[PDB]
Amino acid sequence: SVYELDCIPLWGTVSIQGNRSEMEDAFAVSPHFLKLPIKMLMGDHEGMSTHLTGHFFGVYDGHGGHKVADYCRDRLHFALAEEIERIKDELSKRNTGEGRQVQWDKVFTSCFLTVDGEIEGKIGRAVVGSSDKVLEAVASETVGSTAVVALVCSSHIVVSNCGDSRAVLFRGKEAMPLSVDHKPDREDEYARIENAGGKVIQWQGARVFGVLAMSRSIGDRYLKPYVIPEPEVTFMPRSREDECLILASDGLWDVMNNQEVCEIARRRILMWHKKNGAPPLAERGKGIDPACQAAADYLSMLALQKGSKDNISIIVIDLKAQRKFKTR
């Protein structure tokens, strides 16, 4: 049974300033971090009848400064774990007919909004080391960040997205983006913004008041309620055909498409295994996977090669249990 198998987390990460004048990218990886309630995972068509280990991966592409992306790095997964614990307790007591996608929707919406209110100084926030909560903005009104987050467990990938960072799954031979960029030229977003009294203006791409190229993000109170911190969530059962999952800021996506990124990641992961002995089983999943790290490294080099003039952050995640080469 898939809900019974050991989920060993295999990943690599690169986050560099690149050709930029300052670093505004941040990221967070927390293996074996969450305890996901099976009832939020199992589909209706499956049998009935506690929790699966969940791994957390997040990429935060800051704009207007670095303080919001950093706060997200430091806090967002903890906020999410608080929210899961809440819903987990309600689900143990009551049970609606709530679809899975709807459950994860409310968990991530609350979590993203909580982080956003804390940043704005509207929600009381704990400080590491201190017994006392404070009500105080973490950053000025012009600072914001995208947030793309993925929970991985044995049966499912759940992605929550706010902004134009992106998560892409390689299944079989096809890239499958697991998020849809929040951009003002989306008709739903355009209408949301214009109906709220805002302007979408063509200025090196469609921009909120000509300024911001994304229609959602965490922070950016100067442009509320036009840009909002509300994510969209993708609930994605895994497949034996899945190869790898990539999360990245636009330092990567501006210069390569989804299909070529996936094809390149898979190839570099495979090349590593053809030339290296499998790592010691015991130490696997305790830190970065060298195959994945080689893949993320190569992608960042390629992106720079192709003229990316931005911060580049990439997390490569290997979804194959094992990669052996049958021959003879």
């Binding site: 004048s21 300052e22 302007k199 063509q202």
Partner: protein
């Protein structure tokens, strides 16, 4: 209709035009402290929130000085070249012109003036900033002013926050 027929049959791109606007902001700090911040053409990062770096080669503070600015990510621009046009320490006026960079603000010049103003019994400062610029290709007068005013209002809001914090610390 009206606006539709026009957008389809009567949309011509003019070789060139220029728009202009004005913004205002009350700051709860004495004008001398506000001016001590604003007069520093060579250090706009003291209060302009989108500036990641600013370099001035040669004379730092006097008419003709030139500053090279690198911007933080997220804007439709990454750098700007600006020349100090007016630095009036008698009238508290600062005028600049943009002469380079990868923005779409051509022939941009702007002016900020400070004026003393008491409100709710507390003496503070009224900042007024205006600009004039060429409307770029593909955009309207209105659109161009939404963009610029967004930028300028952010600058003024930050100016107010910085100088108010400074004034608070001073009191103590």
């Amino acid at each position: 209709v009206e606006s539709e027929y026009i957008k389809k049959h009567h949309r011509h791109e003019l070789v060139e035009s220029q728009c202009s606007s004005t913004l205002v902001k009350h700051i709860k700090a004495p004008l001398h402290l506000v001016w001590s911040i604003v007069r520093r053409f060579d250090e706009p990062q003291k209060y302009k929130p989108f500036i990641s770096r600013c370099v001035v080669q040669g004379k730092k503070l006097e008419v003709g000085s030139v500053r090279e600015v690198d911007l933080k990510s997220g804007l439709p621009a990454t750098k700007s070249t600006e020349v100090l046009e007016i630095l009036d320490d008698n009238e508290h006026i600062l005028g600049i012109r943009i002469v380079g960079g990868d923005h779409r603000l051509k022939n941009y010049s702007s002016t900020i003036s400070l004026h003393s103003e008491t409100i709710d019994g507390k003496t503070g400062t009224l900042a007024i900033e205006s600009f004039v610029v060429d409307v770029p290709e593909g955009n309207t007068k209105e659109e161009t002013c939404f963009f610029v005013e967004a930028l300028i209002q952010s600058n003024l809001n930050s100016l107010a926050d910085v100088t108010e914090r400074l004034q608070a610390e001073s009191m103590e």
